[PDB]
Amino acid sequence: MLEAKFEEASLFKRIIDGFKDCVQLVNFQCKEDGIIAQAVDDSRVLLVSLEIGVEAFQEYRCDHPVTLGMDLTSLSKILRCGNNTDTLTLIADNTPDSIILLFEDTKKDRIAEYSLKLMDIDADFLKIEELQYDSTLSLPSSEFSKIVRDLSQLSDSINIMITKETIKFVADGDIGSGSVIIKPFVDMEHPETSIKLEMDQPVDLTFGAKYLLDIIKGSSLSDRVGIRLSSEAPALFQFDLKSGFLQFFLAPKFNDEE
Template sequence: MFEAKFEQAALFKKIIDAIKDTTSLCNFNCTEHGITVQAVDDSRVLLISLLIGSDCFQSYRCDKSITLGMDMSNLSKVLKTGNANDSLTLMAEDSPDSLLIVFEESEKSKISEYTLKLMDIESDYFNIDDIEQDSLITLPASEFQKTVKDLSQISDSLAILVTKDTIKFHVKGEMGDGDVILKPAVDLENTDNSVKIELNKAVNLNFGIKYILDIIKGSSLAPAITIKLTDQNPALFEFKLSSGYLRFYLAPKFEEDEE
């Protein structure tokens, strides 16, 4: 038996909203420790790695490891029927062909139940090595989100340049150039508003901005985003959950990609 109850549906709704446009089909792997997802977009440029630890739930039970293969569009449609502050319970048998989704309103004593058919989805598992990064930056998720949206008006490529003193986001398009420069700053009252740079080596990497626009959909999950950059390697963009994380691994663009 698998049964996972969120005190409020808001967290799971935000997680699904953050990844549903990147991948259409997902395997949710449920174990005694929580739920994990690993999926790639159709172009195989962006990899999603999700961990919802058991402590994220009001109650959690998984007697046997199971895989729930779901169409993200269908899952999203069901989740839209519930309110953010409803409790949300996911239930499945040990050899499931469907997932029971239950919303419960505490104040109105209303219960809504939906049965979502599961799918048999073939997927590759990627062993992601923990590469020592050249630079690690942390900044408010809302700041990164606004920066990406603003600069996406100018170009379809975004360069991130990191030195010990600055983080520079640069775009160059037919209409002109654009730069947003952030300097390290510590907010003692709210550390999530701080901008931090840990540098082993200066970095200058270029990314397809359409993929960054998908990544920033996770901004509602956490107040800050951590970005690990390493020359010639995929970048890691991470939003931390109370128990777990949502990570995006994005391959940089090279000169031959832009020809």
């Protein structure tokens, strides 16, 4: 069973836009403590992991863990109906064939009620995140977006190099090249702008501009993105929600991978 309704349909429409783009399907599933989901591009280098806590729903009941996959573009079309304030109510029975998305106006005039035929995925969820990542930084999300779009002009691969007290994005391509370089610092004038960074061992990872571009669409969800990198493992970029989060595990380039 499943019955969950958000206050503002925007929140759910915001989140889904965050990965609607980098993955073809998403296998959603509700647990007693909230909703979670996961997706992997066909290119098999990008993993999307989502969690919306109960804390984010005005009503929520998942009395029996219903797993349900579905095409994202199809889900986005149904979410276009959005109304970003008028109540969105996910509804899905015990063993569903389609999830019913129900929007209702502030009164009872509009019964916008869509049903989206679910997909069929042979659920193989992955737990690849790890305990210790070589380096860990965070920074204003939009600062990060700029850097990622910018450098992706020059090259198809952005290189993220982290050394002691120095974070350096560098794109080197054909027309030329360029590199943004930032340093950790505080700002109690609005601490959520200060660049936090710990580095257990300096790291140098190169990723695909393509994918990174997708990963920054989660910026419309948080004030600060957090990036953790590991030499022997996909880097974990994350954006926090009011209860829950949205994380993208991107596999660093071998020479391919991106």
